[PDB]
A paper describes a structure:
The CD4-binding site (CD4bs) on the gp120 subunit is an attractive target for HIV-1 immunogen design. The VH1-2-derived bNAb IOMA directed to the CD4-binding site of the HIV-1 envelope glycoprotein is of interest because, unlike the better-known VH1-2-derived VRC01-class bNAbs, it does not require a rare short light chain complementarity-determining region 3 (CDRL3). Here, we describe three IOMA-class NAbs, ACS101-103 derived from the VH1-2*02 and VL2-23*02 germlines, that share many properties with IOMA, including an average-length eight-residue CDRL3 and show up to 37% neutralization breadth. These findings indicate that IOMA-class NAbs developed in multiple HIV-1 infected individuals and provide important genetic and structural information for the design of CD4bs-targeting immunogens aimed at inducing IOMA-class bNAbs.
ACS124 is a mAb that was isolated from the same HIV-1 infected individual, H18877, and was included to overcome orientation bias on the cryo-EM grid. ACS124 binds the gp41-gp120 interface, thereby leaving the CD4bs exposed for ACS101 binding. ACS124 did not neutralize any viruses from the global panel and was not studied further phenotypically. The cryo-EM complex was reconstructed to a ∼4.0 Å resolution, and we also determined crystal structures of the unliganded ACS101 and ACS124 Fabs at 2.2 Å and 1.7 Å resolution, respectively.
Numbering used by the authors:
A (entry chain H): 2 to 82, 82A, 82B, 82C, 83 to 100, 100A, 100B, 100C, ...
B (entry chain L): 2 to 9, 11 to 95, 95A, 95B, 96 to 106, 106A, 107 to 209
The structure:
């Protein structure tokens, strides 16, 4: 069972937030499906559940603004959240509900969870990133290891994701927290530390994705050496 | 209905961590536990009070009193640092309820000295910007100071430094950025990033030369 959230990362105040979860590996009719969110730095907040026969309930705080629905033909379920404000900026998770039929009470829990989609509620427009290589200079090797990286400048909203060599390079990879600048735009760096001997025989490419602006960059990072 | 959790639990490596969740007549409700590591989605690690999902280490166990539930992590590893959330369903109102979360920190790991790399701007100059990037990798504990110099003079303007972030190997990394104009970058003979960690300093210097 794999759950794949999708939908805009940016919603203007008073507009409607719409997200969709595509389910593969099981029929959408087999399980109860829930949405959860987490405001940045805060705890987990339950939104609601749906079942394909129409059974639903919601967080009472959200009940008057929220609908969850199922699309049988595409094996999807969706969240609709009306009249959003900045209070609705959050990472939104779609989850499969598991349950055990024990008569007394309800045994209901969540497994698995989607990866989460950050939705930022803002009147500001989307801005795509510019990517610059952080190339190992003639003096930057540190013994037997060398760091290289990518600088991802001036995007909005979050997030950008960075992989290296299409995900084949994971050891030593670190993507830093984004810096919110005085301009209101974000920037971040991503680095990988590799054996110094590999700079002469291995290609390094940072794969930058900024879904809100539909931008993808594959940036070769060439050692100066 | 409300679920109480301590905000913080600190544990030494190899010892046993206990995360408690309290609520009214919790004894009559089934309790479930989720682990959320930094930058990741939650994962179920205990359901139905004490059952362990497939693939979850047996170091994780769940138990229940009449008024509290406990997630116990035995032989704690640095990789177990995470926020842990308890969850129940309130059958009366058909509502899911989460605890406020407990941040588990594994203290007293072994000291690890930082590796510092300084990257000069090259291609960025043609965008009429110049960012020097000072990467600070693989250190523990997660506390550093960064000082920048142009020639021999300290520079504070245009400096931004991130809060140390945990790496996948459980050490910390941080980055510091110095913003210059392209003309300013060419106007000095050298720049330096000086990183102080645990009473020791590492300094890297670079000269304009693209």
């Amino acid at each position: 069972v794999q759950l794949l959230e999708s939908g805009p990362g940016l919603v203007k105040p008073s507009e409607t937030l719409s997200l969709t979860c595509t389910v593969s590996g099981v029929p959408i009719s087999r399980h109860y499906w829930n949405w959860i969110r987490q405001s940045p730095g805060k705890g987990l907040e339950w939104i609601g559940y749906i079942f394909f026969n129409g059974n639903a309930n919601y967080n009472p705080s959200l009940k008057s603004r929220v609908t969850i629905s199922v699309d049988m033909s595409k094996n999807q379920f969706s969240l609709t959240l009306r009249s959003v404000t900045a209070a609705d900026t959050a990472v939104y998770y779609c989850v499969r509900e598991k349950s055990i039929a024990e008569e007394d009470n309800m045994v209901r829990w969540f497994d698995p969870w989607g990866q989460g989609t950050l939705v930022t509620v803002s009147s500001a427009s989307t801005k795509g990133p510019s990517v610059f290589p952080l190339a190992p200079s003639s003096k930057s090797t540190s013994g037997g290891t060398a760091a290289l990286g990518c600088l991802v400048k001036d995007y909005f909203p979050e997030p950008v994701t960075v992989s290296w060599n299409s995900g084949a390079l994971t050891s030593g990879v670190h993507t830093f927290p984004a810096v919110l600048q005085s301009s209101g735009l974000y920037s971040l760096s991503s680095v990988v530390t590799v054996p110094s001997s590999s700079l002469g025989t291995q290609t390094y490419i940072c794969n930058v994705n900024h879904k809100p602006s539909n931008t993808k960059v594959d940036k070769r990072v060439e050692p100066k050496s | 209905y409300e679920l109480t959790q301590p905000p913080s639990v600190s544990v030494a490596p190899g010892k046993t961590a206990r995360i408690t969740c309290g609520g009214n007549n919790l004894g009559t409700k089934s309790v479930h536990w989720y682990q959320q590591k930094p930058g990741q989605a939650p994962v179920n690690v205990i359901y139905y009070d004490s059952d362990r999902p497939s693939g979850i280490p047996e170091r994780f166990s769940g138990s229940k009193s009449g008024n509290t539930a406990t997630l116990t992590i035995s032989r704690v590893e640095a990789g177990d640092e995470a926020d842990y959330y308890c969850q129940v369903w309130d059958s009366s109102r058909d509502q899911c309820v989460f605890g406020i979360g407990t941040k588990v920190t594994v203290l007293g790991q072994p000291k690890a000295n930082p590796t510092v790399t300084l990257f000069p701007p090259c291609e960025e100059l043609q965008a009429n910007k110049a960012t020097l990037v000072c990467l600070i990798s693989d250190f523990y504990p997660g506390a550093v100071t960064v000082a920048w110099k142009a020639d021999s003079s300290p520079v504070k303007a245009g400096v931004e430094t991130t809060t140390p972030s945990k790496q996948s190997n459980n050490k910390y990394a941080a980055s510091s950025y110095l913003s210059l104009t392209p003309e300013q970058w060419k106007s000095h003979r050298s720049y330096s990033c000086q990183v102080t960690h645990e009473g020791s300093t590492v300094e890297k210097t670079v000269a304009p030369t693209e």
